[PDB]
Structure formats: structure tokens, C-alpha cells
């Protein structure tokens, strides 16, 4: 009831032993009470790293999108080593969403090792059961065996109606996913924990299908975009193995479901000027001359037997001497081009001088072997060249035309496929013009390039008119390596030129704050050259690919020096030092911020010979290479862009939390108030708040003004209320609950952004017997639910929303202002829910959590706190606080990564992914949050390190003085594999 505080553990340790004499009763009582719950102390257990590998195939569904709805692929297992380590070998196959599938190596929800399951964005299936939302659900299958060598998992994705179906060795499984969110792009994905050899089979040459694709399901190989080659890659990597060493990699420029939709500019509404009749006539005549000339130049040389037969299609010279239908077909030719010009902002003009007379109106070849052969090309390229601005306008017009063509085809029902197939209405050039291959781009602008330059020759006046906090990734040295004296030198190679700021940052560095924008960093951005301490300052010059910066700090002289390829980057004033005066402060750390699609090499200098250009700059100037004698590679910390709930700081310059006491006719409530509302620099954005302690539902779901004590002692309905202070509009309030894996920092949030998936178990006949639902947050829509009213929009009532939760039945009913809202939820057994509210501030006082009770209702303090399980007095213990969803948090990069070998074995043999060498980490599970971290990550989390050390001493004290019974009890918690790993662990 007061948080993890180590003096209480010290008190317990004092209880264990008195002046070298063990109190057996106290030791046994402590071991009997604190330990079996496994809910207060930080549990630790040896877990195994899990790596996810995907194909680059992305398939999605959107309104008007080109992407096909039904897709299908296979995974052929060829080798599994069950229990290579002490833990079972993880192996799952399924789909996953590009929007929120972030399987960072090490740590994660639950006990870690997240794969194709373990979150609501990705859905998987091992041999026995499927996996989503970190919930395992047995599904009936004929073999009913875990994924073993020689097993073909055939996975089908239906997007028209949401469904992910599985087929194990031909016979389908009896249960599938359904009714999930379709935002983002789906991709095949296999997750494994070493000892795994799998073979991707995507149809066609990229893996021949062992079993037939279900009718109407296209092979997955058909969705590889024309600009990319099919290959197997990890989902999200912050590191890579390049020839010089570990290459740090920034975020990815991942596509979206709305990227595949075509969006053109309307041209029919555009009116046509008299320049139409003035110029478009001769322009269309030039286009006819173009077609005629290309056919006269062999291939389609015309013959008089028929006007437009095979290969003799040109007819009636270069003039539009055609009957009225074909005449209009030739007339509107440049007219539609004029419409696209006036829609995209190009301006129609006229030949003020004798531009047309200067144009010779006769092709230089002048072969004209036939009367139709006559082709009067004006040599418009010869007279007026094509400006690059004009070429970019040609590209925009081609993009508009191709996009409206894509719209025409998708209205007709033409999806995209890499293999060209007319009766299936699938083409390989049907993607939007941005994702078009360059050959098709040239094919589309073949005539436009000339048409536009002929517009110029006729004297025209034509002229030229992702997610926030995931933009960059910051890698910094560990805070245990803060240099406070001396002269140091660390290098950074720029493999991809871009926004990859590099420098020295203080140990207290904000992860979400851009590197160098605040005083906590001193960096150099080589994209344009500018240095950053408090802002951009012109310095040095931009780098190139392969350029290395030998960043230097002299803490004796209080200077920082950047240099590029051994040549010191001079400042604008002319001095070599970028920062002439820096305070030592609390130290400095090698830091870098890579942008999206950026690759760097942060070479600290473990090997001085590997450190290039150091003899030129740094050696014999008195610069020790940073981290030179340190035998282990320096552990780095990357700004993990995964939203995570952290307690609201008391020093937050925009929000404050008030612990208002109980008093009478009022429950204990936690008020949230905007500190700087209605003033300059007022941060008005979506706020995700939860209570730090969760309520856990009754495990076995049993059927199950004066207050009645018997009913309050037998009841399992524990709830509270949320009071929305007057001034905060109800349209931006979301009262409800969150599961402990809610990780959505969506600035534009509503109930349609809520993660959800219905897992449906049916039998062999197909009849449904289970329709379980999964969601990461169960909140009534305050954003749409409120009392009506013509005036008094700032109503005097606070819209008190009570959150009736039965732990036994599972009924999550919501009430508002004394009336029962129609919204009600029903969740599975063994679910932890945090009382959470999402609000957009609109007033000085916005909302508060009223932790109280009602008639025959027992308070939420009973729900979270076991000591007050039968106490009807509402309470606010110091543990129960308000936590806000942080966007970015620092995470330690693992010392070693699972080496996965992927290669295209053959046409039959498909793709081959093999992981053999095992890797394990000692996880630390936070029992009330259902999240695990690396126990090596505690080197910077000194708040948890002290508590865990005191927990170790408490164990060592309860097993003290020959208490072998408690020693056995301790072996269950801290086992000898964990002990031996801690013995051999160096970091």
C-alpha cells in the first residue's frame, strides 16, 4: 500500500535475524506471506530471445485501394530442436500489422520473448494453439501437435471480411481470428527462438506451394511492388552487421494502406480558354505526327489495303482528316492535357513572337514514303529545350493521369498482381504512379514529355506553380560511462547521408526531445552542417556517404571539436572548436540521432587500429579513444519509441496532479489540472492517464442510503467514478479501463482506434462454440456519450461516470449521471485492468478519479489492495497514483543478437531462414504491470536496482542460519540456472 520501498525490506531483514540468532517463526512467516503471491517482489527468470523475420510483401485493405483482398502463403518447417535451452523453442507463423508490430529484441510484455503473438497487432499460430494479445487459446487440429520438422503451415488472410485462417498439413484448424482492425499493412511473419529452420513458400518462383491455395486466394508473391525485389528481412532493427562492424539503423520509411490508393486532381471542372482552339489544334496535330513518325520508323509501316488494320493503323496523313468520331478523338487529344495543366497550376500562353513560324513544321528525315507518311514535326526540341522544372511538371501531369487511370480500374474492379493476368483483372503496373517502376514511368510520360515541350515551343507561359516521436532514434553510451575529465575521441561513419546528428550528450538526456535542440546535447548535424546546442548554428559543411566524423571533447579545456575525414570542420567565424566553453557538469556521453532510413557506424574506438583517421586527428593531440581499454563492447541505449505509462512528474511544466483527501460526502479523488491552460506555450494534446495499480478479475469465473454489511461482505462489484470538471467538454473524454499492454499514443484518438480482435473457435462442422473478444482498452465513449441540451453547454453537473466492474461475472457496465449506459463489456478470466481516462484538455480543471463506493458496493481500494480486501472505507494509498503515457523511453541494446541466416535456397526450396545458436537473458518481471525488462537494464534504473538488491538480501536473510526449508522455498523463486547465469554474467 505504499509502493516498492526498500526500508520495509530492511525492516523485514531485521525481523529475520537478531544478533546472529535466527527467529524461525519470523522467517517462516515472511516466506509464507511475501513469497507465494509473487506480486510484490520483482520476479526474475531466464527467458530466451525471440527474433521475427518477415517477407517484404505488404497487403492491406482501404477504400479504393489497389491491393487485393485475399492472400495466402506457406511456411515449411525443416528442423526444430525442442528445448535447446531450458525453455521450449518458440516458433510461430502468422500475419502482422506494420502500424504497431514492434518486436524489439529482449524484454517486452509478459515474461518477454514476444513473437507473432503477444500483441493485438500481430496474430500467430504455433502447432497447438493460436496467439494474440498475449493469450494462448487451444484450437482443435487433427495432429494437435506443436510445430515440428516436416510441417506445412498454410496461412490465409481474407480482408474483405477480416479473417486469418490456418491449415496445418492440409487439414484446416477449427478456429480463426476475425473482426480485427484493418488499418496498416499485413505481412507474413515467422518468430523463433533459435534451433529453428523454416522455409518460406510464397507461390510461384519464390517458393512453390506444397498444398493448393484456397479458392480465391492469391499466392503471396504477387504483391511484391515493381520497385522492390522479394526478400526476407527482420521487422524492425535498430542495428545491423556491416563489414566494418555494428551499423546503427534508424527507423523505417514504411508504407501505409492509404499509399496504395490513387488520388488524382479533378480536370473536368476546369474550363478551357480560347487558347484551346488557338493551340490545342496544332498540338494534337503534332501528336499525330509523333505517332505517324514512330510507325514510319519501321515496325508499323502502313499499307493502303485497309485504313487501320494490324501494323497499318496510321491513316489520313498527319492531319485530322478523319470522320467525325475519330475527328473528335483526335481533337480532344491536347485538350485533356490542357485540362490537366490548368488543374495542376500550369498557365496557358501564346506565341507572342513568331515561335510557330520559327518552328520548321517539317521533320528532318522527311522520308514521307506514303501520302499518310507526311509527318510535319516542328523540331520543337531543336528550337526550345526542356527545362528541368518543366520535366518535373511532366512528372506531375503523368502522375495525375496514371492516378485517375488507377481510379478508373479500381472502380471497374482491377486489383494489383506482379504477374500480369487480364481475365483476373490484375496488372503489374496498376500501383500508384509514385510506386511505379521506372520503365512504366517512361512509358507513361513518353508522349507527355514531347507534348509539354511543344506547349513550350508554342510560347506557353507554363511554369511551376512519419509518426511523431518515431522520426529519429537516439543511441547513446551508458550513463555509467559519463566522462567528467580528460580528452576523448569517438568516430561516426555516415553510410547513408541524412539527418544523423552526432555529438556529446549529458547523462540526463530526454528521449523524446530532439538531439541538440535542448541544452542537454552538443551535436553536429551533417545533413546540412549545422551544430546544435540550443538551436541550429552554421558550422563546417555537409558530409557524404562514407564520411566519418571524429568527434572530440576536451574536458580539460572545456571544448568540443568536430572533424570530417581528419580535416577539422571550421566554424563560420573561423575557429576550429565548435563549442569554445562547455561546463563539465555531470559528464558527457557519445550520442547520435539517426533519422528515418539512415545508417551510421558509431565506432567508439575499442580497437585503435580499427579507428580510422585517428592518427590524422586525435592522436598526438592528446585524445584518448573513447572506450579503448574497455574489454566488453560499450552497452548502448536507444530511444525505444514504444509508448509506456510512467507516473506524472511533479515537475511537469504543463500538468499537475492533486491528491485531494476523502473528507465527507466526497470520496478520495485524484484531480488532474492543466497547469498552464489559457496562456502562452499551453500544450493542448491528447492525454492518456491511468491509475498505477490494476484490479485483477476473479480467476475462476464463477456464475455468481443505508448500506447492507452482509452484501458488502459478499459482493464482487468493485468500481469507482470519474468526475469531469465543468469547462472540459465531454466530447474529448474517454472513461474506462486498459489492459496492461495498451501502447497507443494516438494524438487523434477515438473508439475506432481501439485495438480489437475476435478469436472464434468452431468445431469440425463449422458451428461456432466460442467467440471470445480481445481489446487493449474497454472504455465507454465519453467522446460521443453525454446528456443533451440546447444551452448550458458547460453544464453544472460533472458528468460523473461510474465504472461498475464485477470481478467474478466479468460484467463491465458503465453508468453516467445516475443512468445506466447501454455500453457493457465482458472479458476473459485472469485479466488485469487499470482505471484509465483519455482526455484532451479544454479547461483549467479537466477531470478527476473519484475512488469511492455506492450502496452495497465495495471500493476500488479493496480491488487493488489485498490487506483491505473487506474494508468498505475508500482510500488513496501512496501507491495509487496517476500515470501518463510517455511517447519514448530509453532501452538498453542487448550485447549479443540472434544471428539469423536467410537465403533463397531455390525455386522449389523457396526461402530458408535458420537460427541455430541460442541466446538467453535474465528477465525482471514487474508483476502488477505484466511487463518484463532486462535485469541488466537496472544499471541505469537505480530506483529498482536498490529495491531488488534489498529483495536479494531479504531472501538471503530468510534463508539465514541453517533454514533449509526456506532455502528450498527460495530455490523455487531464484533457481540455480539464474544463479549460475548471474555468476557468469559480466554486464
Amino acid at each position, epitope marked *: 500500500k505504499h509502493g516498492r520501498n526498500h526500508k520495509v525490506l530492511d525492516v523485514l531483514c531485521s525481523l529475520c535475524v537478531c544478533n546472529g540468532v535466527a527467529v524461525r517463526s519470523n522467517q517462516d512467516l515472511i516466506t509464507e506471506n511475501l513469497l507465494p503471491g509473487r506480486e510484490l517482489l520483482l520476479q526474475t527468470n531466464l527467458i530466451n530471445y525471440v527474433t521475427s523475420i518477415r517477407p517484404n510483401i505488404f497487403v492491406g485493405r482501404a477504400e479504393g485501394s489497389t491491393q487485393y483482398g485475399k492472400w495466402y502463403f506457406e511456411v515449411m518447417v525443416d528442423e526444430v530442436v525442442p528445448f535447446l535451452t531450458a525453455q521450449a523453442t518458440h516458433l510461430r507463423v502468422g500475419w502482422a500489422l506494420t502500424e504497431g508490430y514492434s518486436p524489439y529484441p529482449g524484454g517486452g510484455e509478459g515474461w518477454g520473448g514476444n513473437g507473432v503473438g503477444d500483441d493485438l497487432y500481430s496474430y500467430g499460430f504455433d502447432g497447438l494453439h493460436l496467439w494474440t494479445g498475449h493469450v494462448a487459446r487451444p484450437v482443435t487440429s487433427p495432429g494437435q501437435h506443436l510445430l515440428a520438422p516436416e510441417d506445412v503451415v498454410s496461412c490465409c488472410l481474407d480482408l474483405s471480411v477480416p479473417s486469418i485462417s490456418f491449415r496445418i498439413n492440409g487439414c484446416p484448424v477449427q478456429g480463426v481470428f476475425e473482426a480485427f482492425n484493418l488499418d496498416g499493412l499485413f505481412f507474413p511473419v515467422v518468430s523463433f527462438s533459435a534451433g529453428v529452420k523454416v522455409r518460406f513458400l510464397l507461390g510461384g518462383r519464390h517458393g512453390e506451394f506444397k498444398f493448393l491455395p484456397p479458392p480465391g486466394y492469391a499466392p503471396c508473391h504477387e504483391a511484391v511492388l515493381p520497385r522492390e525485389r522479394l526478400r526476407l528481412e527482420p521487422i524492425k532493427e535498430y542495428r545491423r552487421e556491416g563489414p566494418r562492424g555494428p551499423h546503427l539503423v534508424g527507423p523505417s520509411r514504411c508504407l501505409s494502406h492509404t499509399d496504395f490508393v490513387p488520388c488524382p486532381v479533378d480536370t473536368v471542372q476546369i474550363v478551357l480558354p480560347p487558347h484551346l482552339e488557338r493551340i490545342r489544334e496544332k498540338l494534337a496535330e503534332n501528336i499525330h505526327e509523333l505517332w505517324a513518325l514512330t510507325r514510319i520508323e519501321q515496325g508499323w509501316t502502313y499499307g493502303p489495303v485497309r485504313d*487501320d*488494320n494490324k501494323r497499318l493503323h496510321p491513316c489520313l496523313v498527319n492531319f485530322h482528316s478523319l470522320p467525325e468520331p475519330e475527328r473528335n478523338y483526335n481533337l480532344q487529344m491536347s485538350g485533356e492535357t490542357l485540362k490537366t495543366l490548368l488543374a495542376l497550376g500550369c498557365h496557358v500562353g501564346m506565341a507572342d513572337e513568331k515561335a510557330e513560324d520559327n518552328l520548321k513544321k517539317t521533320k528532318l528525315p522527311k522520308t514521307y514514303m506514303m501520302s499518310n507518311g507526311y509527318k510535319p514535326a516542328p523540331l520543337d526540341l531543336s528550337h526550345v529545350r526542356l527545362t528541368p522544372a518543366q520535366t518535373t511538371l511532366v512528372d506531375r501531369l503523368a502522375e495525375n493521369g496514371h492516378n485517375v487511370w488507377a481510379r478508373d480500374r479500381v472502380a*471497374q474492379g482491377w486489383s494489383y498482381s506482379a504477374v500480369q493476368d487480364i481475365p483476373a483483372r490484375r496488372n503489374p503496373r496498376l500501383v500508384p504512379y509514385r510506386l511505379l517502376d521506372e520503365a512504366t514511368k517512361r512509358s507513361n510520360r513518353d508522349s507527355l514529355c514531347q507534348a509539354v515541350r511543344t506547349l513550350l515551343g508554342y510560347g506557353y507561359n507554363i511554369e511551376p506553380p512519419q509518426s511523431r516521436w518515431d522520426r529519429v532514434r537516439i543511441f547513446r553510451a551508458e550513463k555509467s560511462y559519463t566522462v567528467q575529465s580528460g580528452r576523448w575521441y569517438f568516430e561516426f561513419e555516415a553510410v547513408t547521408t541524412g539527418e544523423m546528428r552526432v555529438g556529446w550528450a549529458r547523462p540526463e538526456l530526454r528521449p523524446d526531445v530532439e538531439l541538440g535542440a535542448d541544452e542537454l546535447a552538443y551535436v553536429f548535424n551533417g545533413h546540412r552542417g549545422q551544430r546544435w546546442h540550443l538551436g541550429s548554428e552554421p558550422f563546417g559543411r555537409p558530409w557524404q556517404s562514407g564520411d566519418v566524423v571524429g568527434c572530440m571533447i576536451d574536458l580539460t579545456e572545456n571544448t568540443i571539436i568536430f572533424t570530417l575525414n581528419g580535416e577539422v570542420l571550421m566554424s563560420d567565424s573561423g575557429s576550429e572548436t565548435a563549442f569554445r566553453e562547455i561546463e563539465i557538469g555531470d559528464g558527457f556521453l557519445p550520442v547520435c540521432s539517426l533519422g528515418p532510413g539512415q545508417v551510421g557506424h558509431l565506432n567508439l574506438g575499442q580497437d585503435v587500429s580499427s579507428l580510422r583517421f585517428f592518427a590524422i586527428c586525435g592522436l598526438q593531440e592528446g585524445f584518448e579513444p573513447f572506450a579503448i581499454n574497455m574489454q566488453r563492447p560499450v552497452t548502448t541505449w536507444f530511444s525505444k519509441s514504444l509508448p509506456q505509462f510512467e507516473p506524472v512528474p511533479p515537475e511537469h511544466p504543463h500538468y499537475e496532479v492533486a491528491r485531494m483527501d476523502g473528507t465527507v460526502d466526497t470520496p478520495p479523488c485524484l484531480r488532474l489540472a492543466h497547469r498552464t491552460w489559457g496562456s502562452q506555450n499551453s500544450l493542448v494534446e491528447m492525454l492518456f492517464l491511468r491509475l498505477s495499480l490494476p484490479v485483477q478479475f476473479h480467476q475462476h469465473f464463477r456464475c455468481t442510503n443505508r448500506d447492507d454489511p452482509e452484501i458488502i461482505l459478499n459482493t464482487t462489484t468493485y468500481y469507482y467514478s470519474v468526475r469531469v470538471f465543468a469547462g472540459q467538454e465531454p466530447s474529448c473524454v474517454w472513461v474506462g479501463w486498459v489492459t496492461p499492454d495498451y501502447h497507443q499514443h494516438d494524438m487523434n484518438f477515438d473508439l475506432s482506434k481501439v485495438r480489437a480482435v475476435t478469436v472464434t473457435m468452431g468445431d469440425e462442422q463449422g458451428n461456432v462454440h466460442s467467440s471470445l473478444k480481445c481489446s487493449n482498452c474497454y472504455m465507454v465513449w465519453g467522446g460521443d456519450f453525454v446528456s443533451p441540451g440546447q444551452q448550458g453547454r458547460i453544464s453544472h453537473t460533472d458528468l460523473v461516470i461510474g465504472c461498475l466492474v464485477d470481478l467474478a461475472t466479468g460484467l463491465m457496465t458503465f453508468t453516467a449521471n445516475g443512468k445506466e449506459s447501454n455500453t457493457f463489456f465482458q472479458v476473459e478470466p485472469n485479466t488485469k485492468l487499470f482505471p484509465a481516462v483519455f482526455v484532451l484538455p479544454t479547461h483549467q480543471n479537466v477531470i478527476q478519479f473519484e475512488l469511492g463506493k455506492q450502496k452495497n458496493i465495495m471500493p476500488l481500494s479493496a480491488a487493488m489492495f489485498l490487506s483491505e480486501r473487506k474494508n468498505p472505507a475508500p482510500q488513496c494509498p501512496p501507491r495509487l497514483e496517476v500515470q501518463m503515457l510517455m511517447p519514448v523511453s530509453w532501452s538498453r541494446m542487448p550485447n549479443h543478437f540472434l544471428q539469423v541466416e536467410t537465403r533463397r535456397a531455390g525455386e522449389r526450396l523457396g526461402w530458408a531462414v535458420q537460427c541455430q545458436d541460442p541466446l538467453t537473458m535474465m528477465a525482471l518481471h514487474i508483476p502488477e504491470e505484466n511487463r518484463c525488462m532486462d535485469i541488466l537494464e537496472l544499471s541505469e534504473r537505480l530506483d529498482l536496482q536498490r529495491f531488488h538488491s534489498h529483495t536479494l538480501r531479504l531472501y538471503r536473510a530468510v534463508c539465514a542460519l541453517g533454514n533449509n526449508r526456506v532455502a528450498h522455498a527460495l530455490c523455487s523463486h531464484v533457481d540455480q540456472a539464474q544463479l549460475l547465469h548471474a555468476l557468469e554474467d559480466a554486464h
Partner: nanobody
Amino acid sequence: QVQLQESGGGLMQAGGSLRLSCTASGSIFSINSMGWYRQAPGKQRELVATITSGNSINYADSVKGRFTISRDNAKNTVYLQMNSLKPEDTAVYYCNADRVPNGYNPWGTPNDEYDYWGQGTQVTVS
């Protein structure tokens, strides 16, 4: 948008006159040539004469019979008349309202791809 309502084709002996009717209802452009594009069992879709909006005949690869295609432009109902049925005409017939009249294309490639396909009617030949 441009939907090609394609009426069924009767079954009748070789050498029998049959009129195939199809209406390309939609945008008033890129419908000038409503020639059929009949796809044979196991073979590539052969091209029937794509007459212009003024019913200008052209040579096609499937002109072994008459293939007298007369589109009534009063209601944009292409009437491919087939007086001489043959063992080639036993195919699934597909009216095509494409932009290029008689295959004549002084335009660009996206424009050439402005072809609206038909429903399809198997006109078997006895």
C-alpha cells in the same frame, strides 16, 4: 462506371446468323470502339473488329467468318452479327468499350489502358 451489359448468345448450328448485343453504359468517352474480345477455351482472347463510333470497320484476327459488327450508336448497343458460325466462335464473348478506335492510338500508354471489359457470354457453336 462504364458497365457493359452483355446479353446472352444463343446456341445454334454452324452457319447460323446470330446478333450479339452489348451496352457500354457509363462515361461518354472511351467507348467509341465497342468491338468484342472473345476469349477461346484455353487460348488467348481474340480481337473482333473494334468499329469506331461511326461504325468504321477494321481488319481483326478473328474475321474468319463475317463478323459483321454494327453498333447501333442511338443507344450505344454494339450488335456483332455472326452469320457463319464456326468451331472457332464457340468462345466466351466479351464486348470491350476501349478508347482507341480501330486500334489507332496517337495517345499515351495510360490512355491506351482505358479499356472497359464486358460481362462475358459463352456463345457455343453446334
